[PDB]
Amino acid sequence: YMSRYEEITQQLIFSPKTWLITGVAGFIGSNLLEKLLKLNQVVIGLDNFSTGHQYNLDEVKTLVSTEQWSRFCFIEGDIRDLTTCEQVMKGVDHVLHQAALGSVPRSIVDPITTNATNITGFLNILHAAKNAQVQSFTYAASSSTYGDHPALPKVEENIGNPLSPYAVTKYVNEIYAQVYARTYGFKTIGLRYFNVFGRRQDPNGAYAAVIPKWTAAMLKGDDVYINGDGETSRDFCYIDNVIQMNILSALAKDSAKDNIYNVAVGDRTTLNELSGYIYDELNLIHHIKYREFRSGDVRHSQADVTKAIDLLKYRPNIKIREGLRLSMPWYVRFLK
Amino acid sequence: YMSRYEEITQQLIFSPKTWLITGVAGFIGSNLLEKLLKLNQVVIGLDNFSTGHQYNLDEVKTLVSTEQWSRFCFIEGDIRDLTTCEQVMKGVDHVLHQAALGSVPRSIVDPITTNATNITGFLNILHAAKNAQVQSFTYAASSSTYGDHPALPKVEENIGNPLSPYAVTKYVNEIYAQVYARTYGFKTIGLRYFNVFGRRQDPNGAYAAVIPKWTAAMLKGDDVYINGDGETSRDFCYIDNVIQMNILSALAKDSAKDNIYNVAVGDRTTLNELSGYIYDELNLIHHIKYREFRSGDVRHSQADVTKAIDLLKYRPNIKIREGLRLSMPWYVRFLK
Numbered sequence: 001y002m003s004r005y006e007e008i009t010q011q012l013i014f015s016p017k018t019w020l021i022t023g024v025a026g027f028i029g030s031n032l033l034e035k036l037l038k039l040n041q042v043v044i045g046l047d048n049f050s051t052g053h054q055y056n057l058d059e060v061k062t063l064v065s066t067e068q069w070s071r072f073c074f075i076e077g078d079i080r081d082l083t084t085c086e087q088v089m090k091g092v093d094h095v096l097h098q099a100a101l102g103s104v105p106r107s108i109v110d111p112i113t114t115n116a117t118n119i120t121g122f123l124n125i126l127h128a129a130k131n132a133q134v135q136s137f138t139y140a141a142s143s144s145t146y147g148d149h150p151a152l153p154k155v156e157e158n159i160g161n162p163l164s165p166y167a168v169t170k171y172v173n174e175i176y177a178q179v180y181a182r183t184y185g186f187k188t189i190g191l192r193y194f195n196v197f198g199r200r201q202d203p204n205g206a207y208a209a210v211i212p213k214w215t216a217a218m219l220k221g222d223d224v225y226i227n228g229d230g231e232t233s234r235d236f237c238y239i240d241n242v243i244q245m246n247i248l249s250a251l252a253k254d255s256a257k258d259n260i261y262n263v264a265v266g267d268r269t270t271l272n273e274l275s276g277y278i279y280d281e282l283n284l285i286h287h288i289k290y291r292e293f294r295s296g297d298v299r300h301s302q303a304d305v306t307k308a309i310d311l312l313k314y315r316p317n318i319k320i321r322e323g324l325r326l327s328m329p330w331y332v333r334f335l336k
Numbered sequence: 337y338m339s340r341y342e343e344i345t346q347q348l349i350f351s352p353k354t355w356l357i358t359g360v361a362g363f364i365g366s367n368l369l370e371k372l373l374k375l376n377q378v379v380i381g382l383d384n385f386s387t388g389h390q391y392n393l394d395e396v397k398t399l400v401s402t403e404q405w406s407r408f409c410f411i412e413g414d415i416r417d418l419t420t421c422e423q424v425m426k427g428v429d430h431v432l433h434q435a436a437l438g439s440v441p442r443s444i445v446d447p448i449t450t451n452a453t454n455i456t457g458f459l460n461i462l463h464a465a466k467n468a469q470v471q472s473f474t475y476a477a478s479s480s481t482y483g484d485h486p487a488l489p490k491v492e493e494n495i496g497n498p499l500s501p502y503a504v505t506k507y508v509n510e511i512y513a514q515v516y517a518r519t520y521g522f523k524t525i526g527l528r529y530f531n532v533f534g535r536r537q538d539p540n541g542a543y544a545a546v547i548p549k550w551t552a553a554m555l556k557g558d559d560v561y562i563n564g565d566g567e568t569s570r571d572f573c574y575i576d577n578v579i580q581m582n583i584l585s586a587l588a589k590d591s592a593k594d595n596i597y598n599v600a601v602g603d604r605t606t607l608n609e610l611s612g613y614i615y616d617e618l619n620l621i622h623h624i625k626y627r628e629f630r631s632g633d634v635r636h637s638q639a640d641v642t643k644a645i646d647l648l649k650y651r652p653n654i655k656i657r658e659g660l661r662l663s664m665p666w667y668v669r670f671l672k
């Protein structure tokens with residue numbers, strides 16, 4: 001039971017608010033959109049369809065009622081444009097900022113566009129939000145920000161040197177957010193996501209994340225690569241845990257704001273064990289080679305989620321194996 | 337004797353190199369331009385005249401020969417435009433990046449503009465320099481990167497939380513520089529300036545620094561305002577000391593790069609002390625109210641310059657009073 005999250009969602013349905021979701025056409029944004037519309041929220045979406053897709057928005061349309069869909073106002077535009085950011089902020093209560101160009105290797109190969117998207121765009125949205133006096137502001141940060149810190153499991157206060165331009169940009173979001181609290185009284189929540197997965201995570205394209213990239217490949221009958229020795233290990237976090245955490249963050253009591261939280265389940269899986277869970281869930285619905293470590297990649301990864309548990313009453317309820325089970329039917333349909 | 341510095345400057349007279357100075361029309365930039373043309377160097381300059389001034393360049397022109405000035409190629413443009421950054425990098429040996437919007441309070445009022453210039457702009461010059469494979473890259477960092485850290489004197493490896501949007505931007509310059517070393521092998525030097533003063537520092541405008549602002553006010557018979565009880569203290573650093581450090585860093589051995597250095601004297605002077613020094617020096621060349629502490633003002637600032645002295649062979653040989661003596665005639669001339 002996700003007790004606190006149930007209670008908060010009940011408040012929202014009784015007293016609905018206006019939400020802004022940036023990155024709404026993407027993986028996490030469109031999952032947020034689906035749950036907020038199902039709570040009868042008014043939703044303002046912004047996306048530029050860089051890595052996001054209109055098909056994600058069309059899919060969410062078919063999953064909600066007509067009245068629910070009628071409260072979604074979609075704005076095609078770019079967070080790099082401050083005017084656009086101010087326009088979409090108007091009358092907004094709760095900001096969920098997901099728009100960014102993700103991926104460590106992308107940042108290495110084009111630190112420039114990435115900087116513009118992830119620092120300039122973040123600041124534009126942060127500043128428009130402060131000026132519009134929104135009730136809350138929650139933004140996607142990253143476990144990449146732990147960098148080379150050798151400690152396991154990862155604890156929020158203890159971070160290392162950032163190991164790529166992507167790590168830098170996300171860390172910069174966090175420091176601007178803190179400076180905003182201290183200089184303006186504008187209290188935010190940053191969510192360090194660990195390896196999120198689930199429906200509508202893009203499997204196509206050179207930057208695909210390991211779960212949908214492998215899922216696709218096994219469905220193709222293609223080779224399943226493994227960047228390095230395979231002992232690299234991760235806290236894979238099903239999207240529903242992330243949706244819980246965004247919504248708990250948006251309605252957090254004030255003293256839980258101006259804080260960073262790990263967003264994950266606290267477990268660890270190696271590239272090598274995941275391969276098998278994926279085969280088994282897929283193989284259940286009727287259907288491997290080693291190589292060089294990837295550049296600027298974090299070696300080993302497990303979150304300590306004690307802080308979200310205690311301060312927000314986060315209750316992660318969906319673990320790697322069940323998330324895969326829940327996720328595979330989506331991949332079959334999308335790829336068939 | 338500034339002796340490694342003398343050896344380096346003698347060598348440059350004998351073997352000119354091509355330098356890029358961004359912010360060339362500003363206080364520190366035009367002073368670098370002056371030194372470099374007098375050393376017969378080839379200098380590419382870049383400035384948008386946002387806080388810099390064409391009269392600064394006209395002044396440098398009157399101080400160097402026709403043949404020296406003919407080695408100055410000046411481009412009016414903006415570091416926020418990557419193309420411009422690439423163009424001015426061509427043929428460049430040594431980068432001295434000074435272009436930025438200074439001032440903590442400017443950044444509080446308009447964090448967006450300060451971000452675009454200080455982070456986007458800085459990243460464009462760093463990236464173009466890396467791509468051009470220049471010999472050296474040195475950038476203007478800031479003592480505001482110490483933030484709330486309580487150590488005093490300030491030592492480079494120990495820093496705190498940044499306290500304004502400005503401080504965020506200058507800290508991010510350092511982080512990007514370190515990440516560029518790590519990921520592309522491009523090793524830079526960051527110079528944490530402390531309260532620099534001297535000729536061509538702008539006395540006009542909401543954000544003038546204390547030394548020129550007071551100097552101008554005494555020359556006009558305007559009220560000199562002390563923000564607080566005047567026991568507040570700084571490590572005021574004459575320009576020539578900064579010129580020295582820039583040149584020592586452009587020519588540093590490889591082991592001294594990918595390092596941050598404080599640039600200052602090592603001394604502390606109170607606002608009360610300073611107001612007396614300024615008066616004394618001016619009135620030798622011939623011619624006060626207390627109010628509220630500036631809000632969110634640092635109380636005491638003093639640099640440990642051990643690292644610069646040991647690793648770069650820096651000599652902080654101009655202290656505050658001699659610096660004021662050297663600067664006062666330029667203000668007298670400038671304002672009469």
Ligand SMILES: NC(=O)c1ccc[n+]([C@@H]2O[C@H](COP(=O)([O-])OP(=O)(O)OC[C@H]3O[C@@H](n4cnc5c(N)ncnc54)[C@H](O)[C@@H]3O)[C@@H](O)[C@H]2O)c1
Pocket residue numbers: 022023024025026027028029046047048049050051052053077078079080097098099100101102103117121140141142143193194195196197202
């Ligand atoms: N999925 C994970 O494992 C993970 C891990 C760490 C951090 N994150 C962060 O989570 C957020 C959501 O990521 P996601 O996995 O859903 O990726 P995604 O690529 O699916 O979503 C990003 C969305 O933002 C939009 N966007 C990008 N730049 C934009 C711009 N300039 N203006 C407007 N829209 C823009 C894209 O079109 C896309 O719809 C991002 O900030 C990402 O950095 C995700």
Ligand SMILES: NC(=O)c1ccc[n+]([C@@H]2O[C@H](COP(=O)([O-])OP(=O)(O)OC[C@H]3O[C@@H](n4cnc5c(N)ncnc54)[C@H](O)[C@@H]3O)[C@@H](O)[C@H]2O)c1
Pocket residue numbers: 358359360361362363364365382383384385386387388389413414415416433434435436437438439453457476477478479529530531532533538
């Ligand atoms: N003066 C100090 O005590 C001090 C203290 C800490 C750091 N610094 C840093 O030293 C550097 C030089 O500062 P300064 O005191 O000479 O200030 P300044 O304002 O006199 O000089 C900065 C120059 O940069 C130019 N510039 C700004 N934005 C630009 C852009 N986008 N494109 C092209 N040109 C641009 C301005 O027009 C100006 O000529 C800056 O990086 C400043 O932050 C100075």
